[PDB]
Enzyme design. Structure first.
Site, short mmCIF file in Angstrom:
data_model
loop_
_atom_site.label_atom_id
_atom_site.label_comp_id
_atom_site.label_asym_id
_atom_site.label_seq_id
_atom_site.Cartn_x
_atom_site.Cartn_y
_atom_site.Cartn_z
N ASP B 108 4.84 -4.22 6.05
CA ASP B 108 4.33 -2.83 6.19
C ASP B 108 3.39 -2.80 7.39
O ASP B 108 3.72 -3.42 8.42
CB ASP B 108 3.70 -2.38 4.86
CG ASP B 108 3.35 -0.92 4.88
OD1 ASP B 108 4.27 -0.12 4.62
OD2 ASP B 108 2.21 -0.58 5.19
N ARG B 109 2.19 -2.21 7.29
CA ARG B 109 1.30 -2.17 8.45
C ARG B 109 1.10 -3.57 9.01
O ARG B 109 1.06 -3.76 10.22
CB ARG B 109 -0.09 -1.63 8.10
CG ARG B 109 -0.09 -0.41 7.26
CD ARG B 109 0.86 0.62 7.84
NE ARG B 109 0.38 1.27 9.06
CZ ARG B 109 1.06 2.20 9.76
NH1 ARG B 109 2.27 2.62 9.39
NH2 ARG B 109 0.48 2.82 10.78
N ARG B 112 3.58 -4.51 11.28
CA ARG B 112 3.44 -3.82 12.55
C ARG B 112 2.42 -4.52 13.42
O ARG B 112 2.65 -4.71 14.62
CB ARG B 112 3.06 -2.37 12.29
CG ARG B 112 4.11 -1.70 11.34
CD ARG B 112 3.85 -0.20 11.24
NE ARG B 112 4.90 0.22 10.35
CZ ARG B 112 6.16 0.35 10.71
NH1 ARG B 112 6.53 0.25 11.99
NH2 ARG B 112 7.07 0.61 9.79
N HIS B 153 4.39 10.65 4.96
CA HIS B 153 3.00 10.25 5.05
C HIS B 153 2.68 9.77 6.43
O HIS B 153 1.51 9.77 6.80
CB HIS B 153 2.71 9.16 4.02
CG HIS B 153 3.52 7.93 4.20
ND1 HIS B 153 4.87 7.88 3.94
CD2 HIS B 153 3.16 6.68 4.58
CE1 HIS B 153 5.32 6.65 4.15
NE2 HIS B 153 4.30 5.91 4.55
N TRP B 154 3.72 9.37 7.19
CA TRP B 154 3.51 9.04 8.59
C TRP B 154 2.93 10.21 9.36
O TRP B 154 2.07 10.02 10.22
CB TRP B 154 4.81 8.61 9.21
CG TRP B 154 4.97 7.20 8.94
CD1 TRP B 154 4.83 6.56 7.77
CD2 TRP B 154 5.22 6.21 9.94
NE1 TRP B 154 5.01 5.19 7.97
CE2 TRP B 154 5.26 4.97 9.29
CE3 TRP B 154 5.44 6.27 11.30
CZ2 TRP B 154 5.51 3.79 9.98
CZ3 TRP B 154 5.70 5.11 11.98
CH2 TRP B 154 5.71 3.88 11.32
N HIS B 278 10.30 -1.29 -1.26
CA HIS B 278 9.47 -1.65 -0.11
C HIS B 278 8.65 -2.89 -0.34
O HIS B 278 8.33 -3.62 0.61
CB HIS B 278 8.58 -0.48 0.11
CG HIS B 278 7.67 -0.63 1.27
ND1 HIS B 278 8.14 -0.90 2.54
CD2 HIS B 278 6.33 -0.47 1.38
CE1 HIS B 278 7.11 -0.96 3.37
NE2 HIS B 278 6.01 -0.67 2.70
#
Ligand SMILES: [Cl-]
Ligand SMILES: [Cl-]
Lengths: 298, 298
Positions: B108-109, B112, B153-154, B278
């Protein structure tokens, strides 16, 4: 609570329909002109332009189904009563209750979506159509990209399955409604609005059921409304009603696409002009909006 | 009363120029940094990290601003919560431990941060694994109606402060639980250790932490996207051997075929789906752990 009457001389009517009552202020004399607000507002957003229209028209300033003081029909898994098709049918029924089977219609925001859907479904009902600061729902979703997603994030936020937006909106509803009003103005604050009008918007927005309807409207906007528009795009159906597209030079519609160019794909007889305004044309630029509408409808 | 979910792991507060990084550290062998994402903390690794610790020195860090890591003050460009900044900060954190070359797995983040670390500072990585993401660029570039609805939510969390903060603050518990639930295969919380849920919920209950998450998402909508854009348009590919894992029911696979996307970004990428939503390491811990161990090992 303390809600000012912003339409002095207008009557207040509850128009019965098969799906619930439509609240309206009615003033003026002459050909009927229905004015429909959008989100997150109520009929009072017309309060600066309605008197000038009512010089020449019987002005009916209606709360959308589920908004303002209009009744809130129970929704269903398809959000049917809050689809623009259903809202248009309900407003047609309301106008019929007044004996208005052929009328002028100007809509802003969600009310403009009702209006162009009305014009596609039942163009015989309309003499002339004006839409303020929208593109068809299909065009918003078709042009959906990073930039538009950020700009009209609420299109996907409010369309999330309940109770997600309801619960979040519930976390600070006063802030959210004020934030929407301010952020879509040219000024970026509430200064373009009449405080008493903001009071109307705040109070309507303070009701959880009203907020749920608004989400229902947006859920419809993401689903059935889009599908209905897609059918028209794909069948080449055009609005045949002469129409005026007005948009704020820094409103929402000019963010996705050049609105007159877009509306020309949706309508055979469309004129269009920008107004030096954010989204809330009748409140930020009432004289300009009123002038444009009077010239077009009369 | 937050549970220790890493029995036998040490706890390290790693100083960086941008604030301390909290990490649990266990195992021995080559260093492997595990980075969680939103709305989680390092404890999301608690089911797989012990298996990894059998073979690696496992460092399970809270992202900058998340969990118990310090929260560097953000700015108008959201700089400390851009993945570029987070990566540089975690590089410094690892450097504090003497790890200038390490394996990295992120979810997830955290994924990234990871692929941005790999683009910016490839020499710091032996191997990279990203879990259930595509590059930020790819999500925005694929932001159509369907995907704007899926990962609303992005765009919601990227709205200017304090709009999401204000909405989230009314009922934080709801939103963190909603996000954990909505992105799982089962659509509820059953995949999670309830003690882990309590970590996530406690982190989410802090308004500052929530602000940081929005800053992360703001960075995600702006600087992160810009940085990615530069790399994609320059044909900059990750040189570090990489494993892309994604949940068959996760988010990444909604945008596009993940391996094909990652092959555009990485010269040496292998990919496997995992039957999971996810939250691969919690929904599918044995499978995730096996995939990571296999990939990071000889
Ligand atoms: Cl249709
Ligand atoms: Cl768990």
């Amino acid at each position: 609570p303390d809600l000012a009457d912003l339409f002095p001389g207008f009557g207040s009517e509850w128009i019965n329909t098969s799906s619930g009552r439509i609240f309206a202020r009615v003033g003026g004399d002459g050909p009927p002109l229905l004015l429909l607000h959008g989100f997150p507002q109520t009929h009072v957003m017309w309060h600066r332009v309605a008197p000038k229209l009512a010089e020449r028209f019987k002005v009916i300033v209606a709360d959308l189904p589920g908004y303002g003081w209009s009744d809130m029909p129970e929704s269903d898994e398809q959000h049917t009563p809050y689809t623009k098709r259903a809202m248009a049918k309900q407003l047609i029924e309301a106008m019929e209750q007044l004996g208005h089977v052929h009328f002028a219609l100007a809509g802003h925001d969600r009310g403009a979506r009702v209006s162009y859907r009305l014009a596609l479904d039942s163009p015989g009902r309309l003499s002339k159509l004006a839409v303020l600061d929208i593109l068809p729902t299909y065009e918003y979703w078709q042009r959906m990209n990073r930039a538009y997603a950020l700009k009209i994030y609420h299109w996907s936020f409010l369309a999330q399955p309940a109770p997600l937006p309801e619960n979040l909106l519930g976390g600070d509803p006063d802030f959210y409604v004020k934030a929407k009003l301010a952020s879509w103005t040219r000024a970026g604050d509430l200064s373009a609005f009449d405080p008493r009008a903001v009071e109307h918007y705040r109070i309507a927005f303070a009701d959880p059921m009203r907020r749920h309807v608004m989400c229902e409207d947006y859920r419809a906007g993401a689903y059935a409304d889009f599908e209905h528009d897609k059918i028209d795009v794909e069948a080449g159906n055009k609005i045949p009603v002469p129409m005026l597209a007005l948009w704020g030079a820094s409103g929402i519609a000019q963010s996705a696409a050049t609105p007159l160019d877009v509306w020309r794909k949706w309508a055979s007889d469309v004129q269009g002009a920008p107004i030096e305004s954010g989204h809330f044309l009748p409140e930020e630029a009432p004289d300009q909006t009123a002038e444009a509408l009077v010239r077009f409808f009369s």
